[PDB]
Amino acid sequence: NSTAELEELLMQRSLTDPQLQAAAAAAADFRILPDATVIKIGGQSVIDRGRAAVYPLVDEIVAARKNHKLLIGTGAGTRARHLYSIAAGLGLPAGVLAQLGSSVADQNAAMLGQLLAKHGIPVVGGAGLSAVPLSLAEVNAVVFSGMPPYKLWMRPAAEGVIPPYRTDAGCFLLAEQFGCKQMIFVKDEDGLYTANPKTSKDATFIPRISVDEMKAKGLHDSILEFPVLDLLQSAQHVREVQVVNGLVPGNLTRALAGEHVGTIITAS
Amino acid sequence: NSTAELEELLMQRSLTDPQLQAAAAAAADFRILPDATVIKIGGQSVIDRGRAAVYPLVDEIVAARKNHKLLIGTGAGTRARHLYSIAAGLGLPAGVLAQLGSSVADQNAAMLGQLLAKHGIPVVGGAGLSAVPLSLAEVNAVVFSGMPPYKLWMRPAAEGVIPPYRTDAGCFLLAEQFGCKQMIFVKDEDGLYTANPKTSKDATFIPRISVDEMKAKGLHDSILEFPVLDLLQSAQHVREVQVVNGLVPGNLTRALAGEHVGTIITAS
Amino acid sequence: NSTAELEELLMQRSLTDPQLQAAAAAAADFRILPDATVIKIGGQSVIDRGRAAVYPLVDEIVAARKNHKLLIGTGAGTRARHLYSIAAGLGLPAGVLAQLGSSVADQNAAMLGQLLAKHGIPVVGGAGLSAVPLSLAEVNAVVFSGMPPYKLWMRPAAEGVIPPYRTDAGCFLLAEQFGCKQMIFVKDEDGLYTANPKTSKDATFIPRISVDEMKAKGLHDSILEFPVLDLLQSAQHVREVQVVNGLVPGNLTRALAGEHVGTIITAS
Amino acid sequence: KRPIRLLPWLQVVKIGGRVMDRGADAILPLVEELRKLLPEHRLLILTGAGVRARHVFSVGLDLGLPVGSLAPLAASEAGQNGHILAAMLASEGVSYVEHPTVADQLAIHLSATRAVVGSAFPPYHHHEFPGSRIPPHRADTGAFLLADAFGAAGLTIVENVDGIYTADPNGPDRGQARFLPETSATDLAKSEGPLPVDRALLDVMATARHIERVQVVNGLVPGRLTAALRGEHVGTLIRTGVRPA
Amino acid sequence: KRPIRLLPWLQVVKIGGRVMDRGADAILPLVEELRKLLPEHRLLILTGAGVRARHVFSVGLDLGLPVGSLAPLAASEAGQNGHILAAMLASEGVSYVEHPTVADQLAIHLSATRAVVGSAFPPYHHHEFPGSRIPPHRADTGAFLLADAFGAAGLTIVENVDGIYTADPNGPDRGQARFLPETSATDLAKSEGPLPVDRALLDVMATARHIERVQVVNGLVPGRLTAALRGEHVGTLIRTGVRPA
Amino acid sequence: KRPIRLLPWLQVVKIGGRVMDRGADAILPLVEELRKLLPEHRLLILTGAGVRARHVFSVGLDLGLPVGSLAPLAASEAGQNGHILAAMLASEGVSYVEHPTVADQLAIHLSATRAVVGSAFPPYHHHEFPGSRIPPHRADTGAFLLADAFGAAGLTIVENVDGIYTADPNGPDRGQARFLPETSATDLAKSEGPLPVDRALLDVMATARHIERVQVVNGLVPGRLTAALRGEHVGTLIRTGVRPA
Numbered sequence A, B, C: 001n002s003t004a005e006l007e008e009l010l011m012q013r014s015l016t017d018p019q020l021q022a023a024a025a026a027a028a029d030f031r032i033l034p035d036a037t038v039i040k041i042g043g044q045s046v047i048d049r050g051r052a053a054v055y056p057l058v059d060e061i062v063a064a065r066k067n068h069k070l071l072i073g074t075g076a077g078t079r080a081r082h083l084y085s086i087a088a089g090l091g092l093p094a095g096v097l098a099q100l101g102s103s104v105a106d107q108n109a110a111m112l113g114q115l116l117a118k119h120g121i122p123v124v125g126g127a128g129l130s131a132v133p134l135s136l137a138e139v140n141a142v143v144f145s146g147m148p149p150y151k152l153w154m155r156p157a158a159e160g161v162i163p164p165y166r167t168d169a170g171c172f173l174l175a176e177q178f179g180c181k182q183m184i185f186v187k188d189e190d191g192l193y194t195a196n197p198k199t200s201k202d203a204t205f206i207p208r209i210s211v212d213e214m215k216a217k218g219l220h221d222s223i224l225e226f227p228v229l230d231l232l233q234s235a236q237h238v239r240e241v242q243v244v245n246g247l248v249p250g251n252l253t254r255a256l257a258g259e260h261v262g263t264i265i266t267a268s
Numbered sequence D, E, F: 001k002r003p004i005r006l007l008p009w010l011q012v013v014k015i016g017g018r019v020m021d022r023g024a025d026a027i028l029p030l031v032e033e034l035r036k037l038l039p040e041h042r043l044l045i046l047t048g049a050g051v052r053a054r055h056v057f058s059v060g061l062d063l064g065l066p067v068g069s070l071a072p073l074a075a076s077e078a079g080q081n082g083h084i085l086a087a088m089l090a091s092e093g094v095s096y097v098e099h100p101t102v103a104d105q106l107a108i109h110l111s112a113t114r115a116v117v118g119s120a121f122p123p124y125h126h127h128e129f130p131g132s133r134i135p136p137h138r139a140d141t142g143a144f145l146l147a148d149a150f151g152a153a154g155l156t157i158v159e160n161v162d163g164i165y166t167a168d169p170n171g172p173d174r175g176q177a178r179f180l181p182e183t184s185a186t187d188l189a190k191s192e193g194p195l196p197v198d199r200a201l202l203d204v205m206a207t208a209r210h211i212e213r214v215q216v217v218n219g220l221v222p223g224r225l226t227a228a229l230r231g232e233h234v235g236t237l238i239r240t241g242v243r244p245a
């Protein structure tokens, strides 16, 4: 390959041309925010539970940003499920539901941000390029709303009108785009099990698994949005994710310290 | 009370229900920016006077932010009075006047902000959650425009179309909402007197007074917007305010140091 | 003169009145960001060249901001020339072309900003009053898009529809407005020559020249937009500019250190 | 004189958030009724918040947040209801418009099309008044402030009940709840119990300059909104105390 | 060829800030005249700044601020005048529109309604040109730049005087002020004294591509704006120097 | 049931960026054809990006930037093409509208005027999907996602070629390129070579709910867009696989 061969293909072919696609794949790979970790704080699993769940995580975030640069994204939760129920019952399409769910993730970012403001940590749009906050020891963290931007241009699922890319996908793709070193989903279970632990009494804990193994066992749409597993397999930068229980004191702190709490899900 | 009793009332009653209102009043009380002081820099009383008044206050702000986190709001002044006169003469309602007056407070914030920019102090929207500036020793202060957001939805006064909530109310409510420790109004008189000191030769200085005492003497609408006195009586966080003369060198510095310059007005 | 004489003229005369114009000219002169340097990073001359040109300049910027406060503006380049060609061929006026060219400078600011984000340096709107970034040693620099705001209200040139005020003018006027100490244009030639060095083999290098001397030799529209030379002659604060070759390793570093690389062009 | 009327030909209609909460069973008939009204009136349709605002209050209060934090969080739910209702009317030319657009450009938008939808909450936001931990200036109040500032021809409030009763007709004392065909704001302001309208609505009625009456009608009964917009008495009339010039 | 005309059917009308400063006594008759013009023309109405900009210049200059700081501060006053004028015309479908909307979406807005109001100041802002401590590109200049970029059918400037005189007719030398029914921009550009129009207006006239003449008329005399919009000579005609293709 | 149609009377037309790249020789006839279509259809006209996006990809890839950086950079070029096309139609009441306006207020804008222009790229931005270093959700894909979400009456794609061939008809193998009058998305999705449409277009066709066919026609041949908007077969029909209810 070469720059010239690539620029010639870029000028002379469709972007769909396999030859152009292959020349592009040989391009250099810049990581924009390589030393940051993206964390998703669950909507239904954490923020909807109020003080008992959120306050200890705020204390963990405040402590952790001393050693760790954090992009903290919010989930949506029960108010988005309510919006989806109303709008789906009216026959509205996935793209309209997508906009509705963004508002709920925004509410949750506001509430978390107000608990963090006196500690210097802002709510932002554009977390990945929130260069000033992330370069300051007094700050070193930002909060953002976890829904993706697709809104009316959301691709629907194969069935139904629930948007398939919601705040797990939003947060994951930000980590991937900015070339972050780590992606931690903070939920309300210890990690992945062989069945739904809330539903099934004898579910077995899984410390580590690949996306292919998850699909081969039928765990495609469990504790993570199943579309995130496919995004994970295509990812250039973030090739595994960790799922942890934010309700366990210190669990987020320990995951940031390299402890293998929860479940690690690998692209391959 | 309990969380459950509250959530049940929140689901089953009108928000107007006395029972729900009382359960809500027992909720925990978080202060978002407890270590900050809100200062209002008068429009007519200070910024309209130009260099002689503004430059020394800029020097005081620059010095003070070394020891004190400041949210600095601007008043509006003679150009807003001109807008109000034109618009009231056309029969325009209070809500339209309210928008007009915002622009003048914005001008004044711009002018102050440009004198402060080389000292690292920004003009912001969202002062109360200006988490990054307020957490930095190099900064520790922000400037904001002091009018409230109500615009066309401004409640009118009982008589006339002048907006009753202007920049004293704007600044006060920000202090109250963010749970700030102190609210200082910077004007062009030493504090409150028994009569208008510009009009009355033998007015007596009042160092300290309650809102009820002010009303009982007929001082409801003097050196502060009278609606601010009512807001002050309803406030959860900021239960007194201090009024000081920004034209006296160091007066703002000394008020921030806990000196009882000027007048202290208490909710009760 | 006096404040009173000035305020009386401001109230009683047209702004076109020579008497008022002269009283205004005696006003005090505040420099908003006196310790900053504005740098323009060429679009065609640098960013369009990709990695080989841009990466070393990013390293220089990162090193330089340790000792120097920088406002870094982007040029536009070949994609703007393409837009201008399409739109001029349709008969569109200069004001419409002006908007189109802004988008290309914005693209270039985005790309530079993403290479600088991990070093704490943001892309901003409002560079001149980017008070917080510029007051931090961890930051001390911002990137902005170099086109002026005039858009549809762009004054056309005497001939043709190419906007006459583009990113050299945009950057220069920001330096001038904020009273910056220095303006450095970073291009792809060592400085000014007696003829176009790309076109003419025996062009002679000019280390230092005035705007009048440039016009007297016919160099009005060479390595700088000719309208910038006129702006330079009217400027209050920035009365010379330096043109340097960003393709030479360290050239920007050395110009910031007071070395006379390149060409210095003086108002008088 | 009282201030001039800015949009004297405007009808404002506030749709309760709890009506929207009933989903398609309530919304589809309301949408069909609104469709038939488009040729008859120039409509600003404003939505309230409903049950999701109670949930965000539950969370926000548990986190200790002040009343100025809760106000925009509730307002969001009213905006989402407005986007849902506007989507159902899009094929008739109706869209949701934002608060700045309502405040500054409503005249051009109602020249472009027959109706627009907006959020009924007012932008009090972090400058909401202290005292109660529940934001006092809510959807009824916001809609009335706009209607009266514009000098609109009317404000009609569309509820999930027939109107105002002497007690909550879905509550513990519903046995003694008597329907009130007509009432004044001042009489209501001196009662203590719950109402289907904001208490702050009564306050802004006292300082009103134009709107003389506001009718509360049952949006679950087809035809009542249409009748109310013609002045017919089909719910509770609230007299504001404003008199003609 | 010269650039095409974007909105060849547009009439642009610039209302002086000092006309607005006279309050209801001037504004009400102007509003009545504009109301009667709405069915006759497709109007972009742009307001200037007037006396409040002189006050913010007084303060800003006393604080030492540069000319690029003063430009947006003055522009604000023109925007407020535009909001006042639009409010008076709201019942006729007229609203204020922002500069980005004027620059990119005027065609759809004048399809929605008969007229819109905007600020006549151009967005030069902190990129205002240096030289004078007073912003040179003001309301006359902004309005002309738009009118000519759009290729509008005309620009009429509405003043508080009959037109241009050989000296300020309200000034120390008003005794020798002779009225000028017609003049060229180049002749004006070489005079030194005050004018009722920006000197930068003459500069942008020199580089103009479409507008051949601009009439300055007295907005305090009812009917002159109407007559000017029909081409009748009732104030001072300024010839820009543009010729027909 | 499938979701309702929001704007069932809408026709969406996507104009290729490489058509705009041909300049006046292509654009002027297209603009004249669009002018004549304004009274016949309610049009959302969406522009793609063309050759300038290839240049910003060249630079961005040389700088190592990821696919989510390149997506908005390309989208910019589509927006500029939309501003150019809208300017040419301004005298007919047409303007460019931004993505939030398209997503939330298209109904009021197509009540105000007969057509509007927007960018065909979808706002995937930094949340573009990984895998390829070239943004997959481009202008064809964005236009289809909107058309199908709205339940539009059609989407017509205006190309610089007659339609889809079995090989690139301007490429090394153009000798063996056979024209395809009709094809299905699923058949196309299993081919490997280049296409004149995004491969992601085929993916969003598979999950579509309303649009049954999309015609690709040559915008360089006057009259083909007009014919396609009436259902006439003048290019390549792509069957999405959606069936009637």
Ligand SMILES: Nc1ncnc2c1ncn2[C@@H]1O[C@H](COP(=O)(O)OP(=O)(O)OP(=O)(O)O)[C@@H](O)[C@H]1O
Binding pocket: A041, A042, A043, A044, A045, A046, A074, A075, A076, A077, A078, A166, A167, A186, A187, A188, A189, A191, A192, A193, A194, A195, A196, A197, A198, A219, A221, A222, A223, A224
């Ligand atoms: N196989 C499984 N293993 C572990 N947990 C599972 C499994 N299947 C389902 N779950 C459940 O999925 C839930 C995670 O989904 P949930 O929507 O609560 O996450 P969230 O991040 O809170 O989403 P949002 O943030 O949008 O509300 C967990 O509460 C967990 O009990």
Ligand SMILES: Nc1ncnc2c1ncn2[C@@H]1O[C@H](COP(=O)(O)OP(=O)(O)OP(=O)(O)O)[C@@H](O)[C@H]1O
Binding pocket: B041, B042, B043, B044, B045, B046, B074, B075, B076, B077, B078, B166, B167, B186, B187, B188, B189, B191, B192, B193, B194, B195, B196, B197, B198, B219, B221, B222, B223, B224
């Ligand atoms: N009883 C009183 N005691 C002291 N001062 C009084 C009294 N009554 C009236 N005043 C006057 O009220 C003035 C304060 O109002 P003013 O509008 O100047 O404040 P401001 O903060 O400058 O308002 P804005 O900032 O919007 O212009 C003081 O100048 C003071 O002389």
Ligand SMILES: Nc1ncnc2c1ncn2[C@@H]1O[C@H](COP(=O)(O)OP(=O)(O)OP(=O)(O)O)[C@@H](O)[C@H]1O
Binding pocket: C041, C042, C043, C044, C045, C046, C074, C075, C076, C077, C078, C166, C167, C186, C187, C188, C189, C191, C192, C193, C194, C195, C196, C197, C198, C219, C221, C222, C223, C224
């Ligand atoms: N007399 C001269 N001396 C030196 N250089 C000259 C002269 N005349 C023309 N030039 C050329 O002008 C060019 C600078 O213009 P160019 O548009 O490349 O700058 P730019 O800052 O990259 O603009 P943009 O940033 O908008 O692309 C230099 O490449 C230089 O070769």
Ligand SMILES: Nc1ncnc2c1ncn2[C@@H]1O[C@H](COP(=O)(O)OP(=O)(O)OP(=O)(O)O)[C@@H](O)[C@H]1O
Binding pocket: B013, B014, B015, D015, D016, D017, D018, D019, D047, D048, D049, D050, D053, D138, D139, D140, D159, D160, D161, D163, D164, D165, D166, D167, D168, D169, D170, D171, D193, D194, D195, D196, D197
């Ligand atoms: N005196 C009363 N008369 C009638 N209804 C009452 C009264 N007191 C309480 N209510 C209750 O108020 C309920 C209406 O609820 P509410 O007013 O909160 O909903 P909404 O108006 O739809 O919501 P939003 O204010 O967010 O638009 C009625 O169903 C009734 O149960």
Ligand SMILES: Nc1ncnc2c1ncn2[C@@H]1O[C@H](COP(=O)(O)OP(=O)(O)OP(=O)(O)O)[C@@H](O)[C@H]1O
Binding pocket: C013, C014, C015, E015, E016, E017, E018, E019, E047, E048, E049, E050, E053, E138, E139, E140, E159, E160, E161, E163, E164, E165, E166, E167, E168, E169, E170, E171, E193, E194, E195, E196, E197
């Ligand atoms: N040669 C002149 N002919 C006519 N008027 C003049 C002349 N020179 C000065 N003037 C003064 O200009 C005044 C008009 O003021 P000016 O042009 O500043 O106001 P405006 O156009 O309303 O304001 P803005 O420019 O903010 O819209 C006239 O009333 C007159 O006193």
Ligand SMILES: Nc1ncnc2c1ncn2[C@@H]1O[C@H](COP(=O)(O)OP(=O)(O)OP(=O)(O)O)[C@@H](O)[C@H]1O
Binding pocket: A013, A014, A015, F015, F016, F017, F018, F019, F047, F048, F049, F050, F053, F138, F139, F140, F159, F160, F161, F163, F164, F165, F166, F167, F168, F169, F170, F171, F193, F194, F195, F196, F197
């Ligand atoms: N199988 C094919 N059939 C037809 N054209 C093809 C095929 N494969 C490649 N092409 C090429 O695709 C070109 C069209 O280019 P492309 O689709 O990139 O432009 P566009 O649609 O105008 O751009 P944008 O996607 O930015 O709007 C045709 O001119 C042709 O050379």
Ligand SMILES: [Mg+2]
Binding pocket: D016, D140, D159, D196, D197, D198
């Ligand atoms: Mg109610």
Ligand SMILES: [Mg+2]
Binding pocket: E016, E140, E159, E196, E197, E198
């Ligand atoms: Mg004038």
Ligand SMILES: [Mg+2]
Binding pocket: F016, F140, F159, F196, F197, F198
């Ligand atoms: Mg194509």
Ligand SMILES: [Mo]
Binding pocket: none
């Ligand atoms: Mo949004």
Ligand SMILES: [Mo]
Binding pocket: A106
């Ligand atoms: Mo937002």
Ligand SMILES: [Mo]
Binding pocket: A110, A113, A123, B129
């Ligand atoms: Mo917020």
Ligand SMILES: [Mo]
Binding pocket: A110, A113, A123, B126, B129
């Ligand atoms: Mo925020």
Ligand SMILES: [Mo]
Binding pocket: A123, A124, A125
């Ligand atoms: Mo931000």
Ligand SMILES: [Mo]
Binding pocket: A125
């Ligand atoms: Mo936003």
Ligand SMILES: [Mo]
Binding pocket: A125
């Ligand atoms: Mo947003």
